[PDB]
Design a protein around this ligand. Structure first.
Ligand SMILES: CC(C)N(Cc1ccccc1OCCCCCC(=O)O)C(=O)c1ccc(-c2ccsc2)cc1
Ligand SMILES: CCCCCCCO[C@@H]1O[C@H](CO)[C@@H](O)[C@H](O)[C@H]1O
Length: 271
């Protein structure tokens, strides 16, 4: 019974994922691996190609509406911020499409998103990343890791750790059906500070985790220790976000000309 019930639950979360996220890992890898297609991403690897891309690629956030221009490294950071906020919106709609998340009182929904979205973002980031760079502009561009490394501190430093995580995470070869459960588990997390109904979120979390371990025995029958490995990645993501927040505190302190989106301010407010 348990195995069957959890299979149904996993399908419902997968559908939530497919309904709400702009890009799947399946579509991202097909673009990254240069699979047969009539278009390839424009490669952004330096100042000239960045400029060409702001001229020639289609961006969800129009450039005129980014904060006023400061310099190349900051401009890149503003593009990072734009896409981060866009992903928070997707994650919010994904979570809302899970009935046991929507049943929670709205204040607990906010607390879970507040403390979970960055972990979920850096996990789902891996889907559009390879060792050489990442997709941007809905897959119409590819920004090289080497170019991101070339930006001045503090902006290069806040980027490279996410590549290090992503390449290791991609070696586990999760697909979108795995990620739907993994991200649902990240968000529905009973450990978040200030939660009102902890036992309820703990129970949901546990249900998602049992669903996940069964999902992996079916979908990845030959992959030994894959479930405990993913529990460790959940732990790892907390540390990655702790780091990230500390780096953001330093950008707020030392980069006073750099504009920080007010939603992200509300997220770091307490951390
Ligand atoms: C949401 C993900 C995570 N990112 C950002 C990102 C990726 C990898 C490492 C770090 C990143 O952002 C750290 C700062 C985040 C500040 C917002 C905040 O306070 O969280 C991106 O999708 C992204 C988007 C656009 C570009 C780009 C465009 C033109 S040239 C480069 C590069 C990356
Ligand atoms: C869209 C989901 C993402 C939500 C982002 C984080 C929300 O921040 C928090 O919102 C609360 C009001 O609801 C305040 O009481 C907190 O002080 C503030 O930190």
């Amino acid at each position: 019974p348990q195995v069957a019930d959890l299979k149904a639950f996993s399908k419902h979360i997968y559908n939530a994922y497919l309904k709400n996220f702009n890009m799947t890992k399946k579509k991202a890898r097909s673009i990254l691996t240069g699979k047969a297609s009539h278009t390839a991403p424009f490669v952004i690897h330096d100042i000239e190609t960045l400029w060409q891309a702001e001229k020639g690629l289609v961006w969800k956030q129009l450039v005129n509406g980014l904060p006023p221009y400061k310099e190349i490294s900051v401009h890149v950071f503003y593009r990072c911020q734009c896409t981060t906020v866009e992903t928070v919106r997707e994650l919010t709609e994904f979570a809302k499409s899970i009935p046991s998340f929507s049943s929670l009182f709205l204040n607990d929904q906010v607390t879970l998103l507040k403390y979970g979205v960055h972990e979920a973002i850096f996990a789902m980031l891996a889907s559009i990343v390879n060792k050489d760079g990442l997709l941007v502009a809905n897959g119409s561009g590819f920004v090289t890791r080497e170019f991101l490394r070339s930006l001045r501190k503090p902006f290069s430093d806040i980027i490279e750790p996410k590549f290090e995580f992503a390449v290791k995470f991609n070696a586990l070869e999760l697909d979108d059906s795995d990620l739907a459960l993994f991200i649902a588990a990240i968000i529905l997390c009973g450990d978040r500070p200030g939660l009102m109904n902890v036992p309820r979120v703990e129970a949901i979390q546990d249900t998602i985790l049992r669903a996940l371990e069964f999902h992996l025995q079916a979908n990845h029958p030959d992959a030994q220790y894959l479930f405990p490995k993913l529990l460790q990645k959940m732990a790892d993501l907390r540390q990655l976000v702790t780091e990230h927040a500390q780096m953001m505190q330093r950008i707020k302190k030392t980069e006073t000309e750099t504009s920080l989106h007010p939603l992200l301010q509300e997220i770091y407010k307490d951390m």
